[PDB]
């Protein structure tokens, strides 16, 4: 049974467990520190014996920082053997309750506000430690294995790898636009917006008081769906208007068709960063557009071709500045 780690001889299994941190992209990791408890339980094994007691494991842990990197959206960490300075004094099956506390992690706040929030993980697991005689006296940890508490008969936990099991998993959500300086995170801004896209008609023969047409999407990142209060709706602004539009799900995506005068704002109100971003004007006879736009705090720029929707595709709305300048440009 693969879901088992087993011995070498009569060498101790050695058993880590690996913490699953979901974050999505334009976001710093956080400083968290995530421990496991091990609580002995009493029961009954299928020779007839009760499950042996008395034994502690020590605490667990495994720490985030702002050094620690995701790949496809998470971030995986391993605690070290969690029977390092363990020793067993006899034979028998040693059972004990595994579960995350909800420790080692503060929101960063301003002006009485919290920016991020983290969802903790509330699975328990059953750990199975059958411990047996050496030949010559003493005992070894023979075989480990988990079953997820709370599940009609449950199986037995697959490790990921050689010794280690995926039993936890946590999600770090974050709003866009609050660590607007690049220099210093800490100057956090409460008010800022999500995302700002400001039209400019550029030329001596552009019109200032037509409508220019827009189509915008926005994909809530991976991480939404197991955030600690998932986004449903968001709150958008432009002219005099404002509208709360509703998430679809599953796609997790809005899409929203608006206006622009020249001066004129598009505003979203609230995003999680790892947001994206697909914005498209309607092309108009005469104009070629171009944008100017920050992304997650980079300045970059695109240009269109004359009279052709011109459009911005997968922008990130990360947790530094977000904003967008379009010009429309005319010839004399």
Same mark, same amino acid.
Not at 101 to 106: D, H, L, P, R, Y
């Given at each position: 049974?693969?879901? +088992? ?9 050695? %058993? ?10 334009g976001?710093? &990791? ?9 609580? !002995? ?12 007691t ?8 495994? !720490? ?8 496809? *959206? ?20 040693y ?5 995350e ?6 929101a960063?706040?301003?002006? $009485?506000?919290?920016? =991020?929030?983290?969802?903790?993980? #509330? ?5 199975h ?28 936990? !697959? ?13 770090? &959500?974050? =709003?866009?636009?609050? !660590?607007?300086?690049? *220099? ?17 008609? *550029?030329?001596?023969?552009? =019109?200032?008081?037509? =409508?220019f047409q ?14 600690e ?6 709150? %958008? #602004? ?7 539009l ?12 608006f206006?622009?005068?020249? $001066?004129?704002?598009?505003? %979203? ?5 790892g ?13 070629t ?21 011109? &459009?911005?595709?997968?922008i ?5 500045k977000n ?6 440009? +005319?010839?004399?």
């Open positions: 049974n693969s879901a +088992i780690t087993k011995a070498n001889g009569e060498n101790n299994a050695v %058993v880590k467990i690996n913490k699953t941190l979901n974050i999505a992209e976001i710093t &990791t956080p400083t968290a520190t995530f421990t496991f408890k091990f609580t !002995e339980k009493t029961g009954q094994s299928s020779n007839g014996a009760p499950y042996q008395g034994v502690a494991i020590p605490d667990r842990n495994v !720490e985030y920082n702002k050094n620690d990197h995701p790949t496809a *959206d998470k971030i995986q960490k391993a605690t070290e053997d969690i029977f390092s300075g363990v020793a067993y004094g006899h034979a028998g099956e059972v004990y309750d595994v579960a506390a909800k420790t080692g992690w503060q960063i706040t301003k002006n $009485g506000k919290t920016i =991020d929030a983290m969802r903790y993980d #509330k699975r328990t697991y059953e750990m430690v059958i411990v047996k005689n050496k030949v010559n006296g003493g005992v070894y940890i023979s075989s480990v294995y988990f079953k997820e508490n709370n599940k009609s008969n449950a199986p037995k936990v !697959e490790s990921s790898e050689q010794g280690v099991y995926n039993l936890f998993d946590n999600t770090y &959500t974050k =709003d866009a636009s609050k !660590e607007p300086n690049p *220099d210093d995170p800490s100057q956090v801004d409460p008010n800022a917006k999500a995302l700002t896209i400001t039209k400019k008609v *550029d030329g001596a023969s552009g =019109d200032k008081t037509r =409508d827009f189509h915008i999407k926005i994909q809530l990142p991976s991480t939404n769906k197991t955030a209060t998932p986004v449903t709706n968001i709150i %958008v #602004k432009h002219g005099s208007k404002s509208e709360v509703a998430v679809v799900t599953p796609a997790d995506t809005v899409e929203y068709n206006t622009l005068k020249d $001066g004129e704002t598009f505003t %979203v109100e609230q995003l999680p960063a947001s994206k971003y697909t914005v498209t004007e309607t092309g108009v006879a005469g104009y557009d171009s944008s100017i736009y920050t992304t997650n705090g980079a300045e970059q720029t695109s240009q269109g071709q004359k009279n052709v929707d011109f &459009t911005l595709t997968d990130l709305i990360g947790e530094k904003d967008n300048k379009v010009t429309n440009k +005319i010839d004399d």
